[PDB]
Ligand SMILES: CCCCCCCCCCCCCCCC(=O)OC[C@H]1O[C@H](O[C@@H]2[C@H](O)[C@@H](O)[C@H](O)[C@@H](O[C@H]3O[C@H](CO)[C@@H](O)[C@H](O)[C@@H]3O)[C@@H]2OP(=O)(O)OC[C@@H](COC(=O)CCCCCCCC[C@H](C)CCCCCCCC)OC(=O)CCCCCCCCCCCCCCC)[C@@H](O)[C@@H](O)[C@@H]1O
Ligand SMILES: CCCCCCCCCCCCCCCC(=O)OC[C@H]1O[C@H](O[C@@H]2[C@H](O)[C@@H](O)[C@H](O)[C@@H](O[C@H]3O[C@H](CO)[C@@H](O)[C@H](O)[C@@H]3O)[C@@H]2OP(=O)(O)OC[C@@H](COC(=O)CCCCCCCC[C@H](C)CCCCCCCC)OC(=O)CCCCCCCCCCCCCCC)[C@@H](O)[C@@H](O)[C@@H]1O
Ligand SMILES: CC(C)=CCC/C(C)=C/CC/C(C)=C/CC/C(C)=C/CC/C(C)=C\CC/C(C)=C/CC/C(C)=C/CC/C(C)=C/CC/C(C)=C/CC1=C(C)C(=O)c2ccccc2C1=O
């Protein structure tokens with residue numbers, strides 16, 4: 223669409239030109255070039271709120287989005303027309319595919335996640351610390367399209383998994399595992415965060431021992 | 446401490462499968478070679494494609510590519526406007542200037558090959574990689590019991 | 592009865608019998624042997640290790656690879672079912688392959 | 694096996710075998726053949742009586 | 745102490761040759 227390319231350009235010169243250049247060539251020591259990134263990168267960075275960024279620190283955080291679906295598509299199409307690259311998968315109605323990205327096999331997705339993704343992220347997709355001021359976030363907020371486009375492009379110190387390294391069938395299983403491991407209730411009581419020994423130890427010290435000592439003080443005497 | 450002169454975020458290179466080398470008042474972005482492979486090499490005699498984008502910030506410049514892996518042939522206007530760019534290659538994903546290479550010497554993905562880009566004012570060597578775009582994974586024949 | 596000599600030659604290589612700690616899955620078993628860098632893709636019953644090309648991994652990616660010989664493969668039978676398990680449980684087997692930006 | 698295999702005055706132990714599980718070369722077939730050898734009610738004696 | 749046998753160099757180094765492979769166990 224010609225009318226959609228020009229509305230995506232007027233959105234860019236008002237928000238993005240300061241840190242990415244007028245020709246998408248990059249402003250030195252403020253931001254990189256945007257040639258060859260495609261609309262998958264744009265979708266991931268704008269839908270999750272990472273773009274536009276507000277300062278230069280160890281890692282740019284996520285925040286509420288600045289644009290909506292129409293504007294996101296316009297920006298994505300404007301960027302795609304300047305070098306190509308990956309594209310967001312769509313559905314039969316031309317919208318962003320959400321339901322169709324969920325795979326069948328959760329076990330294969332699970333053991334792919336455990337080998338490729340559980341190092342930075344947790345067993346089930348919690349946070350993880352990186353070198354100096356950096357970290358891997360929680361995966362409990364992202365919709366299937368976001369999970370798919372995260373590992374297609376490579377946002378930051380997270381690597382990129384091309385469609386040849388992880389075919390667009392294993393990715394569906396991975397996203398299915400990520401989506402399922404976030405909406406399954408705990409069995410055996412309150413989850414205590416899902417980190418393991420540390421919350422368990424703290425819960426012990428702050429509940430069990432406090433109760434025991436209180437009971438002992440009630441039964442026993444003073445002085 | 447992470448928000449000083451040296452910042453971990455501002456120096457990050459784009460993940461594009463290509464080089465972002467500079468020249469005389471000209472910035473070249475996403476420079477790569479299209480050469481669909483079938484075996485260990487791409488044999489001499491085969492023609493391959495060179496793709497990039499040239500940008501300047503303020504009024505014209507001419508250009509010419511030379512290399513050592515065969516000869517490079519250009520087709521198009523091959524000049525840059527004031528506040529515009531020159532797009533040569535259309536990588537898979539885009540919905541006319543063309544750079545073709547005769548490839549006297551065989552090439553393979555994984556290595557870097559030197560290309561010289563010369564303008565009317567500036568000239569640089571680049572040492573470009575090879576990039577495959579939206580091509581799916583090629584089939585591998587199944588093994589046996591052993 | 593539980594005292595063992597650790598520096599005892601038990602592993603056959605291309606140079607005779609050698610101690611365990613000097614060897615891994617990447618040690619050649621005869622001169623000129625081809626060891627492939629394989630990746631873990633599928634289920635145990637679906638050829639868990641397959642070959643790989645330089646074109647598969649792009650700039651700023653990383654993959655885990657294992658040593659795979661033509662003499663194993665598929666894991667359909669019971670003979671290659673215990674040979675594909677030793678590869679995946681080897682202490683010193685896994686390798687990280689990275690591609691650096693030009 | 695065939696009726697001609699047993700002599701008059703012989704005895705053999707036989708097991709139930711289907712076409713769907715033979716040649717325990719694969720892992721699934723090995724499991725199936727192990728299952729029919731460890732059955733507690735599986736073995737049968739086949740006897741040939743002199744005419 | 746610093747580990748002996750862990751040293752940086754300034755040698756260029758050549759591109760590896762194509763693997764041929766001896767056919768069968770010797
Ligand atoms: C002797 C007695 C022993 C027994 C005592 C036990 C009592 C405690 C609990 C009671 C038992 C109930 C049994 C039924 C269990 C049940 O039916 O199960 C519900 C579900 O619940 C959680 O689901 C949340 C949503 O429902 C889901 O929708 C959502 O997905 C999920 O999100 C997770 O997953 C996502 C991935 O998608 C991530 O994104 C995301 O981050 C997260 O991980 C949610 O989880 P979460 O946030 O945990 O909930 C928070 C808890 C919060 O608990 C707690 O009060 C904390 C208890 C532990 C405290 C101990 C800490 C010690 C700290 C020290 C003090 C440190 C400092 C000192 C050191 C230094 C000292 C020097 C100064 O309640 C709240 O919501 C808000 C607070 C209200 C609860 C108040 C009740 C008790 C409070 C006690 C005091 C009362 C005063 C008044 C308070 C209002 C998950 O677990 C699920 O598995 C689980 O299925
Ligand atoms: C508290 C009151 C007492 C008063 C004393 C102190 C008060 C203030 C004085 C502090 C000095 C000014 C600091 C601000 C400047 C600043 O912001 O900095 C610049 C930039 O720097 C980084 O890069 C360096 C360059 O700019 C880059 O060009 C370069 O490349 C990079 O090189 C690394 O990286 C490269 C890759 O890029 C590699 O190539 C390369 O090899 C290398 O690795 C650089 O980094 P690097 O050398 O790490 O550090 C060097 C910086 C680092 O900053 C710092 O001041 C360090 C911060 C620590 C401050 C010291 C704390 C003192 C402890 C307390 C006094 C004890 C508490 C006791 C309680 C009281 C008890 C009561 C009884 O200079 C200094 O040390 C300054 C020296 C001054 C310190 C003097 C204090 C010690 C004397 C003891 C006095 C004791 C008092 C009382 C005794 C009786 C960048 O990235 C950015 O971040 C940053 O922007
Ligand atoms: C690695 C190391 C050596 C540790 C020390 C690091 C360090 C510098 C500590 C700072 C920690 C804090 C509090 C950071 C924030 C900044 C800050 C306010 C700094 C200091 C402020 C100050 C000097 C004055 C304020 C006065 C004051 C008394 C402050 C109160 C701060 C307190 C008490 C906070 C708690 C501190 C702390 C480290 C607690 C650890 C608790 C742990 C390990 C539990 C883990 C845990 C988790 C992670 C769950 O997800 C969870 C989910 C559901 C139930 C339970 C849990 C659970 O227990």
Ligand SMILES: CC(C)=CCC/C(C)=C/CC/C(C)=C/CC/C(C)=C\CC/C(C)=C/CC/C(C)=C/CC/C(C)=C/CC/C(C)=C/CC/C(C)=C/CC1=C(C)C(=O)c2ccccc2C1=O
Nearest residue numbers: 419420421422423424425426427428429430431432433435
């Ligand atoms: C009292 C003493 C240690 C004797 C000294 C003897 C001596 C000098 C010998 C030399 C040995 C050396 C060299 C010393 C180093 C000690 C060492 C390295 C370890 C050895 C192991 C050892 C001796 C352990 C004993 C530690 C000890 C006595 C702890 C008692 C803690 C007490 C008295 C607190 C009770 C009050 C209470 C209910 C507190 C409220 C809850 C809180 C916040 C308690 C603190 C707390 C604790 C204690 C956790 O471990 C913990 C773990 C995970 C998450 C959170 C917590 C946590 O919050």
Ligand SMILES: CCCCCCCCCCCCCCCC(=O)O[C@H](COC(=O)CCCCCCC[C@@H](C)CCCCCCCCC)COP(=O)(O)O[C@H]1[C@H](O)[C@H](O)[C@@H](O)[C@@H](O)[C@@H]1O
Nearest residue numbers: 592593594595596597598599600601602608609610611612
């Ligand atoms: C107060 C408690 C301790 C008291 C110490 C007093 C001494 C008592 C121990 C002396 C017993 C010596 C036994 C002699 C036999 C002999 O000569 O052993 C050979 C190698 O000789 C040698 O160099 C001898 C070197 C001895 C020094 C090494 C011992 C020091 C270290 C190891 C501490 C040991 C404690 C172990 C902890 C146990 C864990 C539980 C807490 C190697 O044999 P190997 O090739 O493995 O062949 C066989 C297989 O076939 C067969 O399956 C079987 O594995 C073996 O029978 C094996 O010998």
Ligand code: HEC
Nearest residue numbers: 237238241252253263264267273274275282454457459460
């Ligand atoms: C300066 C501050 C800005 C502004 C105004 C915008 N961006 Fe964003 N951006 C900036 C940096 C320093 C970086 C790189 C490091 C990191 O990713 O945090 C980025 C990154 C992107 C990307 C990722 C590109 C890649 O894969 O190489 C995209 C797609 C992106 N930025 C988009 C974008 C858009 C559409 C903006 C206008 C709304 C925008 N950024 C503003 C720094 C800055």
Ligand code: HEC
Nearest residue numbers: 338339342357358359360361364369372377378379380381
């Ligand atoms: C270490 C490096 C890794 C690895 C191996 C993986 N991820 Fe993750 N990831 C990492 C970081 C540092 C970040 C933050 C980047 C940013 O904020 O720009 C991420 C981000 C994600 C996201 C998006 C965040 C969200 O909205 O919750 C997702 C969905 C995600 N990562 C998933 C994911 C999967 C599925 C991975 C293996 C296949 C994986 N990551 C690897 C750090 C790292």
